[PDB]
Amino acid sequence: IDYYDYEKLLEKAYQELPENVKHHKSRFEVPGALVTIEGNKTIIENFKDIADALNRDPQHLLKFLLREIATAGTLEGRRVVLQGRFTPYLIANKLKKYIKEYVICPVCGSPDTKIIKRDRFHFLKCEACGAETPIQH
Amino acid sequence: KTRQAEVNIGMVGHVDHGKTTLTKALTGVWTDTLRRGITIKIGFADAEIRRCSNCGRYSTSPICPYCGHETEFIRRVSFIDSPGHEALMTTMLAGASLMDGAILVIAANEPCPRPQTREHLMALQIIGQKNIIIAQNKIELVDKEKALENYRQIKEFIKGTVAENAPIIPISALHGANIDVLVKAIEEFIPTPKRDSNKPPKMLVLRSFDVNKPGTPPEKLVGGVLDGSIVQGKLKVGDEIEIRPGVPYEEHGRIKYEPITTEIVSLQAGGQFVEEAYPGGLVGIGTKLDPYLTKGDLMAGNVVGKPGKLPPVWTDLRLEVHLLERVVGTEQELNVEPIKRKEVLLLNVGTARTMGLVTALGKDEIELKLQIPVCAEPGERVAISRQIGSRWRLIGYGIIKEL
Ligand SMILES: [Zn+2]
Ligand SMILES: [Zn+2]
């Protein structure tokens, strides 16, 4: 896709745009990644804001991360220490996925999904529609 | 050669449209233990442009942001960033010899040409910098309707300017939407120029230091170290260099600088030590000089070269004045009254900064006595700044002529 076709560049410029902001149902309070790569460690110190904006757990995210990523981090007073170097966009890209498979309802889009546990099986889900997607993915 | 930065990309646009955030996002991961320079408040941030072997996309990162595989080194570049509309303006007009292209960051959520956005395009226009890329940022804040209306605006703004053929890339410096396209465009537009390394070396010293610290070893603990931008030729470990204005002496006349010579012991470029450094990025030269002479950035503003082959040092200066039509400011500040005989102007040339006294007037040309000798090649552009209250405002620029 040539740089001179702004139009195609624009749709491709919205599809990377997060859910909460991208489409119709907009949880909209998700403030973006704040990353600080100190020495040889990455630290997203806006973490609590992300999790508390997504109304998901703090450690339920640290995990989804160290999974999609291969580093080790610990949580603390609303920040997070990652063991390697990670550009804000690498992390910005994973949080985007989390919201997609752990914070939104794929039947009726809704930031109102919530994590449920009905068998040793994690099925988490929508308080608005009632769909109970099996999410461990 | 080295994998050091090959080109300098200036990050210009409104101070708030996102230039600062985009730079950090692209450079954060190539940081070791920015600035305000001392003369110009310019900062140099390197970034390795890489290509993901698996998905084929570009980024500024070691590991593909997306698929997760290892990316390959394609090139290393250095962005020039600076909080402060003026400082960037000054650095551009003065050291236009430093940039090789520029990325104009314009916010999509604001009418296109902001007073500050025009000034930059104005400066880029004056220094003939045509290798530009336009980054319409914050696309995450305007529906596709407003977006296309901004695009058109940008298009009408650049027509008949040096950025007339510059792409306009919709991006989210915050979410990184289309950073892969942007990074790739830096390779498409803004490629490493053909430079003849054999030309005699010229480096504009941005900073000078004393890396010494009561760490205390007395041996071959380092001498003075200078940091600057090679703009012509190349420096090589073991080279004998001649520094410019030079070190001050004791009142024969009143103040006199003699040009000093030293030997390069080391050279840092890209984070590592090399045996030969080239333009693009910042270069840290190691000398056999007395750290007592480079401490506190006293050497800042000087030029380095091969003994004999350097620019002429000046003590007086006539210029071909060209006042600027500035839009950012308040009406007072704005309609600049022309320079007057006896005014004390602020001058910026290369990385040198000095005060000058107007001692002559002509038709669009003036004379000035220099507070500090400045090593410069004639025909080089000099940034002229007038005070206006407590501050220093850029009112125009001059062209070095011979007296
Ligand atoms: Zn639902
Ligand atoms: Zn990839």
Side-chain angles (χ1 to χ4, degrees):
Chain A
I1 158 165
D2 56 357
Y3 331 84
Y4 286 102
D5 181 31
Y6 173 94
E7 263 300 35
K8 279 199 184 186
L9 282 179
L10 203 67
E11 187 202 54
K12 190 211 161 305
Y14 282 119
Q15 202 227 53
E16 297 170 281
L17 283 257
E19 294 290 20
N20 67 269
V21 8
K22 188 207 305 76
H23 274 305
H24 328 59
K25 66 284 315 201
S26 296
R27 158 204 329 73
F28 11 62
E29 355 204 1
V30 293
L34 163 175
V35 190
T36 299
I37 300 183
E38 190 125 76
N40 290 130
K41 109 185 33 287
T42 308
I43 177 183
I44 112 208
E45 29 176 308
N46 190 20
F47 203 54
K48 81 144 281 295
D49 291 12
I50 286 67
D52 274 44
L54 295 151
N55 184 62
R56 246 36 167 219
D57 315 54
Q59 287 182 46
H60 188 259
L61 213 144
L62 187 327
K63 280 248 43 126
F64 168 73
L65 280 175
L66 314 161
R67 163 183 116 172
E68 289 282 66
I69 282 172
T71 359
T74 124
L75 63 18
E76 210 82 66
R78 344 283 262 311
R79 90 203 297 212
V80 154
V81 143
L82 254 42
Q83 258 256 171
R85 283 240 178 149
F86 301 103
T87 71
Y89 301 134
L90 190 162
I91 287 176
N93 166 64
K94 306 286 123 82
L95 306 178
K96 164 227 179 179
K97 301 195 166 167
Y98 186 79
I99 301 199
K100 178 162 162 180
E101 32 180 20
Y102 288 109
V103 170
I104 292 191
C105 186
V107 262
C108 73
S110 304
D112 293 299
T113 120
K114 166 177 0 181
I115 149 160
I116 200 235
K117 252 254 274 292
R118 69 223 237 192
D119 209 73
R120 298 218 149 286
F121 298 142
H122 270 203
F123 258 53
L124 289 45
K125 259 350 79 185
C126 209
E127 247 302 80
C129 70
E132 317 183 320
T133 356
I135 81 167
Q136 237 335 296
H137 180 276
Chain B
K1 28 267 268 218
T2 337
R3 279 182 165 199
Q4 72 160 84
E6 298 177 36
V7 294
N8 281 352
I9 308 172
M11 291 303 253
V12 295
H14 186 304
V15 112
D16 286 310
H17 284 191
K19 41 178 268 70
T20 295
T21 291
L22 185 64
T23 300
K24 281 186 184 181
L26 297 183
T27 61
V29 83
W30 303 117
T31 282
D32 243 30
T33 299
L34 294 340
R35 21 252 284 171
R36 63 278 271 117
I38 207 214
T39 44
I40 45 184
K41 324 303 272 179
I42 186 179
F44 285 69
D46 276 39
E48 277 175 290
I49 291 183
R50 323 198 68 167
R51 175 233 159 76
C52 178
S53 42
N54 183 63
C55 70
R57 302 223 270 165
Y58 286 65
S59 71
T60 182
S61 132
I63 292 175
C64 188
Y66 335 80
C67 56
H69 290 61
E70 239 146 39
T71 47
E72 303 183 296
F73 177 96
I74 311 217
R75 191 169 79 169
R76 171 139 181 161
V77 306
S78 190
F79 302 82
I80 297 171
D81 74 339
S82 195
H85 175 60
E86 204 121 307
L88 231 213
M89 278 283 283
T90 301
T91 307
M92 281 208 279
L93 300 178
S97 73
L98 298 175
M99 301 192 289
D100 275 298
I103 287 177
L104 185 44
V105 184
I106 298 164
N109 70 301
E110 268 172 62
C112 179
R114 287 321 293 164
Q116 279 184 29
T117 305
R118 313 189 83 105
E119 305 235 317
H120 285 333
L121 211 215
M122 184 174 294
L124 280 183
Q125 178 66 65
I126 286 177
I127 70 172
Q129 186 52 274
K130 324 196 169 58
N131 305 339
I132 308 171
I133 309 179
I134 290 172
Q136 177 176 28
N137 183 29
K138 316 208 212 177
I139 224 75
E140 73 288 326
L141 254 44
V142 292
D143 55 301
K144 192 236 281 212
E145 181 189 295
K146 288 158 154 176
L148 282 163
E149 190 55 280
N150 183 280
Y151 170 66
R152 272 113 71 171
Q153 289 185 46
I154 293 173
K155 251 306 204 274
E156 145 169 37
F157 172 47
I158 50 174
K159 183 164 228 273
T161 71
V162 238
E164 201 178 26
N165 285 303
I168 300 178
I169 303 158
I171 79 171
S172 169
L174 182 61
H175 305 291
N178 267 348
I179 295 292
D180 75 303
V181 177
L182 175 57
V183 170
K184 159 88 109 179
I186 291 180
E187 286 299 298
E188 199 64 47
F189 312 78
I190 333 190
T192 295
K194 289 321 178 192
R195 311 194 177 99
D196 188 293
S197 17
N198 297 116
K199 288 188 118 310
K202 180 145 74 156
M203 170 196 265
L204 316 183
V205 177
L206 193 98
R207 290 229 169 192
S208 70
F209 336 53
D210 192 291
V211 5
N212 269 4
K213 328 160 202 77
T216 294
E219 25 267 303
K220 273 334 226 285
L221 289 256
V222 229
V225 185
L226 309 182
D227 296 46
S229 307
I230 293 179
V231 301
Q232 185 165 294
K234 61 157 125 184
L235 296 179
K236 193 156 152 230
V237 173
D239 279 41
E240 168 172 358
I241 46 177
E242 183 181 7
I243 320 230
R244 200 6 171 194
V247 190
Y249 254 136
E250 212 198 323
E251 77 180 78
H252 314 3
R254 331 171 69 24
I255 1 142
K256 223 242 181 177
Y257 300 99
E258 202 76 300
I260 122 131
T261 81
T262 198
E263 201 165 311
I264 304 179
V265 142
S266 68
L267 284 179
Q268 276 179 58
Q272 333 181 314
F273 289 79
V274 308
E275 319 182 63
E276 205 157 29
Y278 319 64
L282 235 50
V283 176
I285 123 78
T287 64
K288 335 181 66 9
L289 281 182
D290 183 335
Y292 200 70
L293 296 169
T294 54
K295 210 182 197 298
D297 288 292
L298 282 194
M299 293 276 269
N302 291 181
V303 197
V304 203
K306 265 180 183 194
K309 285 143 202 56
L310 286 83
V313 80
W314 306 64
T315 199
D316 263 278
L317 238 35
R318 121 141 70 161
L319 300 159
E320 180 189 308
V321 182
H322 282 285
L323 297 203
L324 311 201
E325 51 131 324
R326 325 223 306 95
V327 271
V328 28
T330 63
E331 84 313 316
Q332 172 329 78
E333 255 89 305
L334 214 85
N335 197 88
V336 59
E337 277 268 300
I339 307 150
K340 212 114 62 297
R341 275 143 34 113
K342 252 139 189 56
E343 192 174 41
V344 178
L345 305 172
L346 185 48
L347 304 178
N348 289 276
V349 57
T351 51
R353 144 180 165 122
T354 182
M355 295 277 150
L357 176 59
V358 184
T359 83
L361 266 49
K363 202 206 19 164
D364 314 15
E365 138 229 67
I366 52 166
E367 234 131 62
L368 286 131
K369 178 154 196 249
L370 305 178
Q371 194 206 341
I372 351 171
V374 314
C375 170
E377 225 57 52
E380 277 181 11
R381 204 173 301 94
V382 175
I384 293 180
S385 307
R386 178 186 297 157
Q387 187 148 317
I388 289 185
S390 305
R391 294 306 315 106
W392 284 110
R393 181 187 171 69
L394 180 83
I395 40 156
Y397 68 102
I399 305 176
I400 291 179
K401 290 280 145 142
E402 227 105 57
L403 235 176

